[PDB]
Ligand binder design. Structure first.
Ligand SMILES: *[C@@H]1O[C@H](CO)[C@@H](O[C@@H]2O[C@H](CO)[C@@H](O)[C@H](O)[C@H]2NC(C)=O)[C@H](O)[C@H]1NC(C)=O
Ligand SMILES: *[C@@H]1O[C@H](CO)[C@@H](O[C@@H]2O[C@H](CO)[C@@H](O)[C@H](O)[C@H]2NC(C)=O)[C@H](O)[C@H]1NC(C)=O
Ligand SMILES: *[C@@H]1O[C@H](CO)[C@@H](O[C@@H]2O[C@H](CO)[C@@H](O)[C@H](O)[C@H]2NC(C)=O)[C@H](O)[C@H]1NC(C)=O
Lengths: 493, 75, 98, 98, 75, 49, 49, 75, 75
């Protein structure tokens, strides 16, 4: 939705051939696609919502206990039995207590005792898996037209629905042609192995095999009037006291403990129909049909005026707000970036065709300036408005920043990050394959390791590598330890 | 959280059964076993780390057991 | 707790990650370390939303494992204790010696 | 016989009166007037601001959001004075009654 | 209990901040530090065990650190 | 991607017809038409050879 | 300060320890970190001032 | 007078609480720490200066610590 | 306080004379000299420390100067 200053905009430039670029869309941040002689676009995945949810298992968190019973036997006579043990509603445990002539038993010793009490859960947690083919990926696509109001405006764009039923969708941009989206909704987040529990008005996305390993009593989740709770012994606690009688009490509301146990699990919106944020999509952008607006217009013959001071985005990109004081309203904005002490055209536009649409309307021109001091000219002739700017940093700075950004992208996305901005490529595909193999091998080893334990194992691996005489083993241990330290320091985003 | 610091190992020991003695006696062992059986891949990594640090078999076993216990519990 | 008391070692109740008070029976308390309950989610680093973490009753009940229970009905009555009474039986006579 | 309450943690919590102040990236830390109020609990976070957020300068700006806090239920630890105890020793006679 | 098995280390990692990432990142470290500072006596026992099992200094340090981490966490 | 149902012929044009196909182990787009009206099914088959 | 003004590095200005507020031309504001201009001293151990 | 010369070094002392003892105990160290955080390059410069003058680890460490204590304080 | 962290060394130098340049140029040196003159014995102590920590003459003089500079400013 035309995000500028989001800090995660991830510029993507270039086209492989047949005019398409492969990009990966994530909830946090955009992608900015600026090809030659095509309108630039600031695309992102806005929200993913599951239309219909199937409840698979429902644990419970609170519990009320009623109808406490108790049967006892003399020591030698064996195990005590209540008729209500076979009732699935009741939960109970056998204990051994001492009996005697004061307890009514004729023979001294330790006698068996079982005390069965009713059980029902006041509140429940309601895990409900998502069918992977009832999703709805909503990609919002702005046009980056240089309008007056859209600088960071999050309500302006074109909406395209991406579902596994109809993945390829041509989003008709207004006056810019029809962009072609060939997407892959089936390879995002693997919702098959996720359960998406709901708690109470606060849902979360949880990995499938963990919700099956919660020490809470479950149900079938069959929307039945009277449920049959399994493993009810987890809530109710049976205290044998001084080994003379057994008393049963409920352990209490597990809401806080469950909230604690959900740390590291991405949250999710559940207002109205569920809407899954914090997801990624792999839409491939086919820009065959994207035309420009003003390719048929003329050049402006009059001057420009700055209406808001220029500012630098976190990614080094300047933004310019000019107003055209001239009579030929449909026009083009001449834009040359004069370098310091030389007229070298080193800075390039990020708005494909800076166009003034009306005399009254303002226009936002986005442009990447050179890393040095660089003037910028917005007009024609000697009365041309000249913006002076000093972008700070070095090209080595951008290289380091891009390397760190790509390392993070590979950390969250994994093998899929190799396909971000990947215009075709054959070496890139081989890198993706080898990364797939190594990432699967690493994920098998380091699954379920903590924030700090990953760093500890990485330090241990590095120390082992430094002190390994075998050159191959030493190099392997050092290399894997460094990346383990990185993953430990970036995990739990 | 609160549950991460149970009132166990303190100096107050009496005859009467403590609160959830039977249930709380084996919860740590049970969670370690569940994590280990749900992440079998880490077993070979723990073996690898123990084998390249334990000169003797006793040190290998001690380091392997400690790594097996610590990682699920730090989770 | 609430109608369920326990005997806990002193230095552990001072080390519970829950927000305390002075315990001065004051109408309006002043909770200290309130950050333990409320959780601040920065979302996508564009806005911050705050929500309560929920009832800590079950987590506290779990954290009380190994702590001897105690009766609190009416006036408190501490069971699970020991005493060191020394028995002086100088004056104990028998019933039927005569 | 008599118990002196020494410290009272709380277990549940309700949150109200959520506030929020923001500053542009370079302008520094954001301040709510309600930080000094002991009733409210809050944390500073950094969010991105821009012309869409009303800030004139792009970058990451500070943000603090303070919300009221009160505990619905509490746990009420209460130490026992060691000289208000009452040990009740029951002594039978073992007389051989029926 | 439930809190003893946090949803950390699983394969679901995204851009958005997880539930209680900032709070839950350091809870284990904090509880280990609190237990260690509240039971300083066990430090010398851990040192003793590490010293009579670690032939080299690296093994000594590994065993000492593992013993320091495991015992509060098994509590 | 192979096609288990040997010859998918529509017998009557009123009765809906079902086809069983074996997709490749990677993500694959299945096309059941001739032109741009072609119904396109993309399936991701999780697994390894 | 009063009739005098200076150019100071912004980070240094933020670093210098003094109670501060939002500067929103509001009478009776609330000063964050106001403990820097008050000192509490114990008369041995009897009392507090 | 100026705060540069506080009355902290004189031999006169007593049982009673001194004026602003609580703050003045750690005021200087807080200033040194905040200066070090503000300007981290001088850490590298002091490392180089200590490494090119200190033959023994004691010499290098004492020179590094003195040099990192002087610059924030002599400013 | 605030006077202990002066605005010295911040990269905002210009052609215009700064506020209290003449006094603040030498306040620190005056403080060091007056402290080293009112407390002569620390000169003996610093000479001893430099002699017993400084192998070479340059290391000795560096240590002695740093000791006679840090202590007046750490007061
Ligand atoms: C379980 O306990 C409840 C109440 O504790 C019992 O409810 C009784 O129900 C009968 C008729 O169904 C009433 O006449 C009684 O007054 C109820 N008891 C009360 C209100 O205390 C119930 O019978 C018990 N057993 C079962 C199997 O539910
Ligand atoms: C974002 O875009 C919308 C629509 O383009 C802007 O809403 C317009 O606002 C102007 C003046 O602010 C009005 O004259 C128009 O009538 C509005 N159009 C609508 C409501 O459809 C909005 O101002 C832009 N900026 C923000 C921050 O939302
Ligand atoms: C905190 O929020 C409450 C309600 O959310 C505010 O209560 C308002 O109180 C005034 C008079 O005191 C009423 O006229 C309003 O109708 C109340 N708002 C409601 C009921 O939504 C309260 O003012 C807020 N601030 C403080 C400091 O408590």
């Amino acid at each position: 939705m035309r995000c500028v200053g989001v800090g995660n905009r991830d510029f993507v430039e270039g086209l492989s051939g047949a005019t398409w670029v492969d990009v990966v869309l994530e909830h946090g941040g955009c992608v900015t696609t600026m090809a030659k002689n095509k309108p630039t676009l600031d695309i992102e995945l806005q929200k993913t919502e599951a239309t219909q949810l199937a409840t698979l298992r429902k644990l419970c968190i609170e519990g009320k206990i009623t109808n406490v019973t108790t049967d006892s036997r003399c020591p030698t006579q064996g195990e005590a039995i209540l008729p209500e043990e076979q009732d699935q509603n009741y939960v109970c445990k056998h204990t051994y207590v001492d009996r005697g002539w004061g307890n009514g038993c004729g023979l001294f010793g330790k006698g068996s005792l079982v005390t069965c009490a009713k059980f029902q859960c006041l509140e429940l947690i309601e895990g409900k898996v998502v069918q992977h083919e009832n999703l709805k990926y909503t990609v919002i696509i702005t046009v980056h037209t240089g309008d007056q109001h859209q600088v960071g405006n999050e309500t302006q764009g074109v909406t395209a629905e991406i579902t596994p039923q109809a993945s390829t969708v041509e989003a008709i941009l207004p006056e810019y042609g029809t962009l072609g989206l060939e997407c892959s909704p089936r390879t995002g987040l693997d919702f098959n192995e996720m359960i998406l529990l709901t708690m109470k008005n606060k849902a979360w996305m949880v990995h499938r095999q963990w919700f099956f390993d919660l020490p809470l009593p479950w149900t079938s989740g069959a929307t039945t009037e009277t449920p049959t709770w399994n493993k009810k012994e987890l809530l109710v606690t049976f205290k044998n006291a001084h080994a003379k009688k057994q008393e049963v009490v409920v352990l209490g509301s597990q809401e806080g403990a469950m909230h604690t146990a959900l740390t590291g699990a991405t949250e999710i919106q559940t207002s109205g129909g569920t809407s899954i944020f914090a997801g990624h999509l792999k839409c491939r952008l086919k820009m065959d049909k994207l035309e420009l607006k003003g390719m048929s217009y003329a050049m402006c013959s009059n001057a420009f005026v700055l209406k808001k001071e220029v500012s630098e985005t976190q990614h080094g990109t300047i933004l310019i707000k000019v107003e055209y004081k001239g009579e030929d309203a449909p026009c083009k904005i001449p834009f040359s970036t004069e370098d310091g002490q030389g007229k070298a055209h080193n800075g390039r536009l990020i708005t494909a065709n800076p166009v003034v649409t009306k005399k009254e309307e303002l226009v936002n021109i986005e442009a990447e300036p050179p890393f040095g001091e660089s003037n910028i000219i917005i007009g024609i002739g000697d009365k041309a408005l000249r913006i002076n700017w000093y972008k700070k940093g070095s090209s080595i700075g951008k290289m380091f920043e891009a390397t760190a950004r790509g390392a993070r992208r590979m950390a969250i996305l994994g093998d899929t990050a190799w396909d971000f901005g990947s215009v075709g490529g054959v070496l890139n595909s081989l890198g993706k394959m080898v990364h797939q193999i190594f990432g699967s091998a690493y994920t098998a080893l380091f699954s379920g390791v903590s924030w700090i334990m990953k760093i500890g194992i990485g330090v241990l691996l590095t120390w082992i590598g430094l002190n390994s005489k075998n050159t191959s083993m030493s190099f392997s241990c050092i290399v894997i330890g460094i990346i383990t330290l990185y993953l430990g320091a970036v995990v739990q985003a | 959280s609160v549950a991460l610091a149970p009132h166990v190992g303190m100096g107050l020991d009496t005859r009467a059964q403590t609160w959830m003695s039977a249930e709380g006696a084996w919860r740590q062992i049970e969670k370690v076993e569940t994590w280990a059986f749900r992440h079998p891949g880490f077993t070979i990594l723990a073996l690898f780390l123990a084998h390249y640090i334990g000169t003797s078999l006793t040190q290998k076993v001690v380091i392997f057991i400690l790594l097996m216990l610590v990682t699920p519990s730090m989770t």
